[PDB]
Design a binder for this molecule. Structure first.
Ligand SMILES: *[C@@H]1O[C@H](CO)[C@@H](O)[C@H](O)[C@H]1NC(C)=O
Length: 356
């Protein structure tokens, strides 16, 4: 089990002003640290955040969090479930800021909610340094869905934070799972309003100002004021990052299909739409050297217990991540240990290993 620690700096809060926190299982003698950012969509105005507060309150408040959580998938300490990093120090950071980990705003007489995702990550890192992270050799910032996008938005800031704090030997890396979205046209137009079926460009443009959202500096400098929403789209932000980032993305991600207003005999227009989506996402990954992109209709991968099962070209994700670790040793591709694994077949579940 991972044990809850509420942040000692209680000014760094969940949406409702309760303290944010993290769940930790230490592994003495390991100098690897895995910090995982939970996902769960976002909210971008008072009305939709109020609805989320009624029926998704654990994503906005720590008041009802349990004292422990079981680490699963890449957070498991059992080698059978986690061939990759079972002996690492494990950290699960609950998502309670509803801001894709981008916010830096407190609750105030002018803000019903605090959006502090970017500061939560910073404060978790700061407090972990006193609990053994100061001795780390690798800090892998991982996350799923909005947490995967949160990795892209925050990995270089964590790297900069550690350098400025005097820890230049900690190698900061990112693992972004199911957080690589396309700002494409919907299959059928929806009128936003709700969160899941809203086109993501407009939801994020609204959220940035509502949240006081921050993006990585190089990407901000490219897109400039009013256009920072672009940095929430992996294919646009990734080339600006300096930290190594491994991208895991289903080619037919269910959340991508949801925001595209696709709901699954498929007729020609939808067939072409789906095939074109897979081709576009494959294209965006062509120059991403560390990636795992199976041709499946599914959503998230890394913290589920059976994450070991899917393979691309005969290689599982735990194996690909291990090959990535080897590629980042003091050092040319590795014999039989690939790191770029993108399916080329054009329809969901054309890979027989896709989740059932
Ligand atoms: C608490 O966090 C806030 C926001 O990051 C920061 O401005 C402040 O310095 C922190 N205070 C302490 C005592 O860590």
């Amino acid at each position: 089990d991972l044990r809850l620690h509420l942040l000692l700096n209680t000014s760094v809060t969940c949406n409702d002003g309760s303290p944010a926190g993290y769940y930790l299982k230490e592994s003495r003698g390991s100098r690897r640290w895995l910090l995982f950012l939970e996902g769960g969509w976002y909210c971008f105005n008072r009305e939709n955040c109020d609805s989320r507060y009624d029926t998704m309150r654990r994503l906005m408040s720590s008041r009802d969090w349990p004292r422990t959580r079981t680490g699963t998938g890449i957070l498991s300490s059992q080698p059978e479930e986690n061939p990759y990093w079972w002996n690492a120090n494990m950290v699960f950071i609950p998502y309670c800021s509803s801001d894709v980990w981008s916010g830096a705003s407190s609750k105030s007489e002018k803000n019903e909610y605090a959006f502090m995702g970017a500061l939560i990550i910073q404060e978790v890192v700061r407090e972990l340094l006193g609990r053994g992270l100061s001795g780390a050799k690798v800090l892998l910032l991982a996350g799923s869905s909005a947490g995967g996008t949160g990795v892209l938005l925050n990995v270089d800031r964590v790297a900069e934070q550690l350098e400025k704090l005097g820890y230049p030997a900690i190698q900061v890396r990112g693992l972004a799972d199911s957080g690589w979205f396309l700002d494409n046209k919907q299959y059928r137009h929806t009128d936003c309003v709700d969160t899941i079926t809203c086109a993501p460009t407009e939801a994020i443009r609204r959220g940035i100002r509502y949240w006081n959202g921050v993006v990585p500096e190089r990407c901000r400098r490219q897109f400039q004021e009013g256009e920072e929403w672009n940095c929430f789209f992996g294919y646009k932000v990734y080339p600006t990052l300096r930290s190594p980032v491994f991208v895991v993305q289903w080619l037919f991600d269910e959340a991508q299909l949801t925001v595209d207003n696709v709901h699954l005999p498929v007729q020609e227009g939808l067939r072409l739409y789906i095939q074109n989506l897979g081709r576009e996402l494959r294209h965006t990954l062509k120059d991403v050297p560390a990636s795992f992109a199976p041709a499946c209709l599914s959503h998230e991968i890394i913290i589920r217990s059976h994450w070991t099962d899917v393979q691309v070209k005969g290689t599982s994700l735990p194996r690909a991540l291990h090959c990535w670790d080897r590629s980042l040793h003091d050092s040319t591709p590795l014999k039989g240990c690939p790191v770029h694994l993108v399916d080329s077949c054009p329809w969901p579940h054309c890979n027989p290993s896709c989740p059932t």
